[PDB]
Symmetry: D2
Subunit: 224 residues, 4 copies
């Protein structure tokens, strides 16, 4: 009954970061449906709260295993479990801001709980920007392009993202990810697409900055 995973698991999160020189630590928990491509996490700022920047920039920082993959398409992420995998991503904001996230996913054996260890670093978030002024609401749903790296055993992800502005309008960020399974897979997917729907809902109280994230993602092939 498992590829290391179950139809319903639990996940743990521990992020350490530094944005525009501001250090912070975060811990999270959630439950998900790897096979359905659905997940719900609860974040809490253990160190450095309240954060001075939008929680939005960290979202994608907080696991491709939560993707519904068709039979016809090879599932790189799931085939790496429970050993897991690591990933790296650069965030290129339209206003010069630059972020980098690196993560370690590891499927807990007997716990039915997926772990993720991340480090988030960013700088150049303009003081009068939507990030530092917390003027962002959510990311718009997307379509990411996933492509195998020949002779390297890794996957490349490419997605142009848009953060929705409280004041209406979009805010652009270019995502470029490197997906690395902990072991050379016998199998490798052909290039494909992944559609995402990341949503955020703050839940802070004058005693703790906390919030919830949700994600639904589905892999598809070119409709050609």
């Amino acid at each position: 009954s498992k590829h290391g995973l179950k139809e319903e698991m639990t996940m743990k999160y521990h992020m350490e970061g530094c944005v525009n020189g501001h250090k912070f630590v975060i811990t999270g928990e959630g439950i998900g449906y790897p096979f359905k491509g659905k997940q719900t996490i609860n974040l809490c700022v253990i160190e450095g709260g309240p954060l001075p920047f939008s929680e939005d920039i960290l979202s994608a920082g907080f696991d491709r295993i939560f993707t519904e993959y068709p039979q016809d398409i090879v599932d790189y992420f799931k085939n790496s479990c429970p050993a897991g995998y690591t990933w790296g991503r650069s965030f290129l904001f339209e206003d010069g801001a630059v972020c980098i996230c690196n993560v370690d996913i590891t499927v807990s054996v007997k716990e039915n709980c997926i772990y993720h260890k991340s480090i988030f670093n960013g700088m150049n978030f303009p003081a009068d920007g939507p990030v530092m002024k917390k003027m962002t609401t959510n990311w718009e749903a997307s379509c990411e392009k996933i492509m195998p790296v020949p002779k390297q055993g890794i996957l490349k992800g490419d997605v142009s993202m848009y953060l929705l502005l409280k004041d209406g309008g979009r805010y652009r960020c270019q995502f470029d990810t490197v997906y690395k399974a902990k072991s050379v897979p016998s199998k490798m997917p052909e290039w494909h697409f992944i559609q995402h729907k990341l949503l955020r809902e703050d839940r802070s109280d004058a005693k703790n900055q906390k919030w919830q994230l949700t994600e639904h993602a589905i892999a598809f092939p070119s409709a050609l």
Copy 2:
């Protein structure tokens, strides 16, 4: 029997360009199915042939009206016919090369023939690159993000493209387009996706550099 268009039309092309300082003129013809999102053009180099760069860079240079749009999604392009529309696009190659294309589409009334007047300019195509060394085969199929511009009556297109290398491997180009209907539409689509499949087949002979292009494109909504 027409939105200005028919299930089967004909199109004319006249491109004037300059790539890495090399000037050229091109004329083309084809037949298409606006409603099916299918088209086939035949290009011929009238001036400046043989071109010293890949024909591939010009492809996207050579009409969103050839897109199958679902009922539920507003069709900006078709609603602009037959008056047509113009579009602008910057091409950002991964090796520094930069191109700009600007076009004028105009639906011929009684001819059932769509016209397109373009000007293509590019420079910084490295001499030892896949473009100048003609090492490219085709563009990989894609998914473009289409979004309405509030208060402006125009559409923005965003697509990360990949040119396939003869020698295997990808070559990246970032596309950013501005779509402008000749008149303020009463209607405006919500943001959506467009999937493309552009193919190329050279047909040159030691007496003329000629070639054929084909395209199939389908508009979709977020699968969320």
Copy 3:
């Protein structure tokens, strides 16, 4: 008494362009001191005036021969006269706008007058930007890096520019130029620097959009 040039010459300008779909033609004249690295031009909008965008974006569009070169440093531009040379440049604005300029410089023999034929194309200048809202005053002085291209007989120029905002503050544009002498030089400069001081002064009247530009530029070696 001349490298094709004199201590004081005259120059002619004819620019044809299209910015954000708006076409225009421009003609200019001036006098300069190639050897002093000083020049003064007078522009006039022959077609498409009044322009809807800042005149500022065209400035650099309107000749390295107007650079004071030290003895110790080879002067690529001057050594190409009077045959002249061509150059290409991509303009990468911080707000997505993209421009491309291509030029032909040709030293008139018996006229003591330098000619320049340019084509300027640009798009994606946001409607609510400093360019379309004409909120710019001048470019800040700069330092450009000039480097020889091995095995190619051309020069590369690299400069991060800043347009001054009426409302105070900077507006960034990345410049990347390719300098190509019409003939393979026996000599080639080593990489060096060029410092610039481009200024603008409008002179339009309710009967013609006209303006003046000035430039002072000096080549230097690394002060190391």
Copy 4:
């Protein structure tokens, strides 16, 4: 006898990083002439050696206080001593690689020794690139543009860098730094230039990966 600094000091370095997922720790020491704009450091890989990437990418990672400033130009860095300052920088490589460095400089009171605490993160360094293949020799000397940030009490640095290739040729990296004094200065420099000369000399032995860096930098005003 000091602005917190002396004509000759000592400096300590402790870097923690992660490049393309590879973690490492580094410690260094040197002696310098803040007022002469000269410094010499000795690096040693305490953790994660031998590094799999060029030492070159870390160089600029390893203090503007080592800059010769003219009287006429305000010295932001020195005026922050000995309290010191922090700085942030994004590194944008031409092949997609992205790095981020954040540092804390603190002038030791009675030690005459300047401390620097850094964290370096980078990813997307292509496996077949000059960084991962260690094909780089040194950075070419440069000219950086330094500009005050109005209403913010910080400095912005902008420099287009070139790494020299063993195999001849250049490798581009765009530098964008934020300089932040620990306290609001009464004084603020006007925008200016800084010219640099960073050199590297490996000194590793089959028992330790160690190396030496040197730097000479001089602030100047526009020569206009």
